[PDB]
Design a protein around this nucleic acid. Structure first.
Ligand SMILES: Nc1nc2c(ncn2[C@@H]2O[C@H](COP(=O)(O)OP(=O)(O)OP(=O)(O)O)[C@@H](O)[C@H]2O)c(=O)[nH]1
Ligand SMILES: Nc1nc2c(ncn2[C@@H]2O[C@H](COP(=O)(O)OP(=O)(O)OP(=O)(O)O)[C@@H](O)[C@H]2O)c(=O)[nH]1
Ligand SMILES: [Mg+2]
Ligand SMILES: [Mg+2]
Ligand SMILES: [Mn+2]
Length: 664
DNA sequence: TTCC
């Protein structure tokens, strides 16, 4: 049923994805690589003392703090939703092999029994209403750019200077490029404006995955992660094969002579896509304004910040269901892409821009090196973009696409199983927009708070509430998928945006509170996703600019956790056994050092002014700028701090571009 | 060296 066209790096189609410069060329050639990460300055993830520490701490915590999650996934008690064996990984060493990204997910979706388009006219209206509400009255904003991020295909530059030029150029010729694409002249578009080509596969680490201890064997067991081989990938599942990547770390001994203590495994590898910047720029220029709108006007269901911010909304519900979507990104329906594009045209968006947007969502992917002796293959023909990979992470709006899909999906899941008496309110676009608008503002007896696949569905006192309970029960029994669109189920240990929803004996939304996830504190502090890159001189360009700062926001971020104090003590203790030092002291010094260093980057900061002026969010973002791409928004961060991490383009240049794009 |  149509196998995807594939080309070797030697092929001219692949060659053209990389500019005639060192960086680009190395990216294309880059072979498989692995190695211990520098968890903290001067400390390797595989250091014996460290692993030892990790072994004792994980075991002890898991033993003294077993999970407290009821038959309904509600977490009560100690707030622990699972064991602590997640830290038992050799950070820096991936499972082998990584997956080959699927060129088409149509079959994957069908076999999963998911619809190939809106199933009812209502649903069709709702999705289209979602588009109208989201992309309507948008205000221009400067186009911010992450510092030290790669522009990827074709240049692979990191120079903010070059990035800015690249972007500004894009906004100027985006229009001419799009028209080119409307004429089906993709190659011209790519050659003249670098808008097209492919996504460059980058492999992010999931430093902590499921690991269990078999009471029978006394042996540890790492959760299997299925991965598709090249055949499977190019045939959408028709041929080839799916299988568990190997997480066994024994190899480390024989290969690198690294001592591997029993019960430690290789890291899980998530695949990510680096989009061609010339293309994502014009998209990001619209995406941000869309973000601002829904985070403002529809803040009830979309703008979340503090544990209490969340708490307020959820407390007023009679029922709160914590949903969960499996492999959201690879399942994301191509039809939604096309629907959104069609509706945007209707709303009056420039055809060329919509074409750009559409193309960005069906572009080919260049696979680097999923494993030793593997990779360097371009999937899909750049000349005529026709892939269906679902959401492509590096695209300029993957969060909006995910939200647009899941928010409506959840609303529908509610209508379908709990509120048919509302169906009559949705008869046409107008009535639909009106309903959806009211709904997103939290003004109906059914509600939701969400971000892509993570969400909490609520029910106030009313007709729908008895239905909610049946739904939740359907989810518990889990034998029937409540949606025709994605595969939904309840989250075991319900949590939202990193905060666990803590129930008491009542087991009701009103007598509940949001607390940080304790395991996440552990994950972050001992299993970071990247090392400290002490080699990169510019800290603002590192994946972890100021690691030591996280200590300052810790009490704030996790203090509320039921076993906070206990864990800190357990750590302090085990760290002592392992290093003969105070962990507290260690982090305290790191803290002082980084606070001093930070001032060298923050203007307004006296060349030694404390963290007095900084907020907890500021600190967490400075230690992990990644969180700025999912947990928080530019608006939730101190202006002077956001400047350290991001750099923008003239509000004028974007404002002018945005004007030629929007309808009104 | 390698995404939002
Ligand atoms: N641009 C980008 N978005 C990411 C990245 N990682 C997670 N996301 C966001 O998170 C969503 C995917 O949710 P995850 O929980 O990470 O994974 P999943 O594919 O849904 O499935 P699980 O593996 O079962 O959790 C997407 O909608 C993205 O917007 C990443 O590296 N880059
Ligand atoms: N957009 C984005 N989201 C990320 C990224 N890393 C973690 N996340 C968020 O975290 C989710 C699962 O990714 P994990 O890395 O397992 O999460 P974690 O914060 O380490 O901890 P858990 O909540 O216990 O899974 C995603 O659904 C994202 O929303 C990242 O690089 N980009
Ligand atoms: Mg998920
Ligand atoms: Mg997840
Ligand atoms: Mn959740």
């Amino acid at each position: 049923p149509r196998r995807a066209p594939a080309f070797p790096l030697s092929d001219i189609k692949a060659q053209m994805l990389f500019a005639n410069n060192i960086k680009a060329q190395q990216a294309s050639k880059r072979s498989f690589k692995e190695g211990a990460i520098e968890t903290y300055e001067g400390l390797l993830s595989v250091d014996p003392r460290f692993l030892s520490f990790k072994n004792e701490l994980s075991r002890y915590l898991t033993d003294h703090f077993p999970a407290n999650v009821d038959e309904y996934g509600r977490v009560y008690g100690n707030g622990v939703r699972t064991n602590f064996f997640g830290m038992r990984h050799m950070n820096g060493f991936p499972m082998i092999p990584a997956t080959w990204p699927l060129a088409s997910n149509l079959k994957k979706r069908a076999d999963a029994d998911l619809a190939d388009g809106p199933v009812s006219e209502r649903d069709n209206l709702l999705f289209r209403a979602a588009v109208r509400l989201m992309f309507s009255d948008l205000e221009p904003v400067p186009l911010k750019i992450r510092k030290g991020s790669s522009t990827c295909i074709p240049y692979f530059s990191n120079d903010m200077g070059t990035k800015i030029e690249i972007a500004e150029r894009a906004l100027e010729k985006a229009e001419e490029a799009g028209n080119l694409m409307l004429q089906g002249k993709f190659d011209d578009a790519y050659q003249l404006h670098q808008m097209g080509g492919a996504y460059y596969v980058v492999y992010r680490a999931q430093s902590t995955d499921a690991i269990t201890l078999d009471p029978k064997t006394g042996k540890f067991v790492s959760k299997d992660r299925m991965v598709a081989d090249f055949e499977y990938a190019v045939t959408g599942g028709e041929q080839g094969s799916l299988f568990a990547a190997s997480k066994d770390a024994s190899r480390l001994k024989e290969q690198y002579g690294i001592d591997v203590p029993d019960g430690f495994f290789c890291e899980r590898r998530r695949t990510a896509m680096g989009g061609p910047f010339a293309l994502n720029a014009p998209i990001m220029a619209v995406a941000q304004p869309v973000r601002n709108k829904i985070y403002s006007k529809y803040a009830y269901t979309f703008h979340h910040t503090t544990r209490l911010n969340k708490e307020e909304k959820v407390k007023e519900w009679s029922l709160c269901v914590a949903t969960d979507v499996s492999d959201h990104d690879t399942f994301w329906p191509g039809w939604l892409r096309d629907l959104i594009c069609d509706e945007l045209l209707n709303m009056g968006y420039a055809p060329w821009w919509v074409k750009l947007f559409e193309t960005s969502l069906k572009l080919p992917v260049y696979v680097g090196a999923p494993a030793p002796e593997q990779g360097h293959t371009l999937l899909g023909d750049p000349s005529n973009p026709d892939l269906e990979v679902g959401l492509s992470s590096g695209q300029g709006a993957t969060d909006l696409m995910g939200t647009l899909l899941m928010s409506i999906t959840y609303l529908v899941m509610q209508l379908d199983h709990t509120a048919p008496h509302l169906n009559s309110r949705i008869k046409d676009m107008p009535s639909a927009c009106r309903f959806l608008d009211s709904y997103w503002q939290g003004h109906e007896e059914i509600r939701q708070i969400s971000k892509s696949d993570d969400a909490m569905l609520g029910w106030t006192k009313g007709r729908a509430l008895v239905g909610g309970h049946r739904l939740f029960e359907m989810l518990k029994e889990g034998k029937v998928n409540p949606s025709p669109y994605m595969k939904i189920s309840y989250e075991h240990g319900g949590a939202f945006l990193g905060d666990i929803l803590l129930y008491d004996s009542r087991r009701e939304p009103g007598s509940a509170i949001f607390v940080g996830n304790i395991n996440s504190m552990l994950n972050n502090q001992f299993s970071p996703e990247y090392g400290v890159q002490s080699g990169v001189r510019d800290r603002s360009k590192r994946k972890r600019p100021f690691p030591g700062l996280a200590w300052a926001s810790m009490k704030d971020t996790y203090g509320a956790c039921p076993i906070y104090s206990d864990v800190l003590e357990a750590i302090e203790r085990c760290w002592w056994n392992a290093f003969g030092e105070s962990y507290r002291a260690y982090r305290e010094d790191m803290l002082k050092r980084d606070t001093l260093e930070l001032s060298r980057y923050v203007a307004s900061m006296a060349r030694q002014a404390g963290l007095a002026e900084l907020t907890p969010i500021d600190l967490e973002v400075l230690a992990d700028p990644n969180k700025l791409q999912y947990k928080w928004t530019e608006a939730d961060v101190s202006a002077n701090i956001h400047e350290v991490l991001m750099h923008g383009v003239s509000v004028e240049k974007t404002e002018r571009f945005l004007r030629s794009v929007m309808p009104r």
